[PDB]
């Protein structure tokens, strides 16, 4: 499972 | 930058005149992924060509596998031609079955 | 042996002709095994090794839920870039991420990755430590001081030491069978002509998996280090894959010529000769 990705 | 596209083009078997095999034109170290690839029998454009999914290397660099059914001759010329905005021109790359 | 979760994203802008097209390809050991694509009317999380039909429709409806909520933030870091960049609104942009962990044996974290490039060069990337980010360029110690302070490096080392490991071992669970395929080369030399009193050896390996391999030439047992050409492995199109690796020699020599051919599918490494018919 992928992780959730935080705004750059 | 822009990465300029490498080009291999080559069969799946050993060919062998009148025999059916596949032929590939393998696209590689390209950026953007934006690329157009076609493959070229005698001079001209083959219909029916089919592309893989497009997948990236660890070094961001994209690349893609193009490839057509066809049944080699002693005589017929086949080439893959890819235009990609990193170069000014469509680059072809011609078979060479002793490659 | 060590065994890895890696997913390799990719956001492409398109100004003008449609949303950013979104992509989400996930390996175990190196193999494709889940493809995320946003280029359709109902984009769903897909299986791309029939092993993982295994997994039930939540884990489907669940992967795609995140990866569209994933899609959705990175359309918005597009145009954060723009901002950073001072770029204007007009061209194609993309972002890439590495993401994943690569566990040995003992299940443990072995390394864990999180890597960003922007138009196809680094932008940051979490370092060894796990503790701290390696920033580019200007634009990335932007990111890196907002990361810095939200802790992102710590959430980061949760998920690459938890989440992913265990998902890695369920994966395997589903997969393991046919993750250990090997196919070991076949190999044969061709000979081709040259000028003069020149002979081409061409020493091919073909129909092996995984791609690793080391094809070398030897000249009486002796192994010659320049002028061997070669290909970069490609290829097949089945699931396996070619290279060749070719030596000029002396016409009448080709006797003294061997091809060696190392491959973890072999018993032993192959030993090869031209065979004049």
């Known amino acids: 499972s992928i992780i959730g990705f935080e705004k750059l | ?9 080559y069969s799946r078997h050993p ?61 017929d010329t086949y080439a893959c031609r890819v235009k990609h905005d990193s170069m000014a021109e469509p680059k072809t790359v011609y078979w060479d079955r002793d490659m | 042996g060590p065994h890895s979760l890696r997913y390799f994203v990719t956001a492409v802008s398109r100004p003008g002709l449609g949303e950013p097209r979104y992509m989400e390809v996930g390996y175990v050991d190196d193999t ?139 994966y395997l669970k589903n997969g393991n069978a046919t993750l250990l395929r090997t196919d070991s080369p076949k190999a044969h030399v061709t000979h081709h002509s040259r000028p003069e009193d020149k002979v081409t050896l061409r020493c091919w390996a073909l129909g092996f998996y995984p791609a690793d391999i080391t094809l070398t030439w030897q000249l009486n047992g002796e192994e010659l280090i320049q002028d061997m050409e070669l290909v970069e492995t490609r290829p097949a199109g089945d699931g396996t894959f070619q290279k060749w690796a070719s030596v000029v020699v002396p016409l009448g020599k080709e006797q003294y010529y061997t091809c060696h051919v190392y491959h973890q599918g072999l018993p032993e490494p192959l030993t090869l000769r031209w065979e004049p018919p």
């Open chain 2, 1 to 9: 930058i822009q990465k300029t596209p490498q080009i291999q083009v």
């Open chain 2, 15 to 75: 060919p062998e005149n009148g025999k059916p095999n596949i032929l590939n034109c393998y696209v590689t170290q390209f950026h953007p992924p934006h690329i157009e690839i076609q493959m070229l029998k005698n001079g001209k454009k083959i219909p029916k060509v089919e592309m893989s999914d497009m997948s990236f290397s660890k070094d961001w660099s994209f690349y893609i596998l193009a490839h057509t059914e066809f049944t080699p001759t002693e005589t």
């Open chain 3, 32 to 170: 494709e095994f889940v493809r995320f694509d946003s280029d359709a009317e109902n984009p769903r999380y897909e299986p791309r090794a029939r092993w993982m039909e295994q997994e039930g429709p939540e884990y489907w409806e669940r992967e795609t839920q995140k990866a569209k909520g994933n899609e959705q933030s990175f359309r918005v870091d597009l145009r954060t870039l723009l901002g950073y960049y001072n770029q204007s609104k007009g061209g194609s942009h993309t972002i890439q991420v590495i993401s994943g962990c690569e566990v040995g044996s003992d299940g443990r974290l072995l390394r864990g990755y999180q890597q960003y490039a922007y138009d196809g060069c680094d932008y940051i990337a979490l370092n060894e430590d796990l503790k701290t980010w390696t920033a580019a360029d200007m634009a990335a110690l932007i990111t890196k001081h907002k990361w810095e302070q939200a802790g992102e490096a710590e959430r980061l080392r949760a998920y690459l030491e938890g989440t992913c490991v265990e998902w890695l071992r369920r």
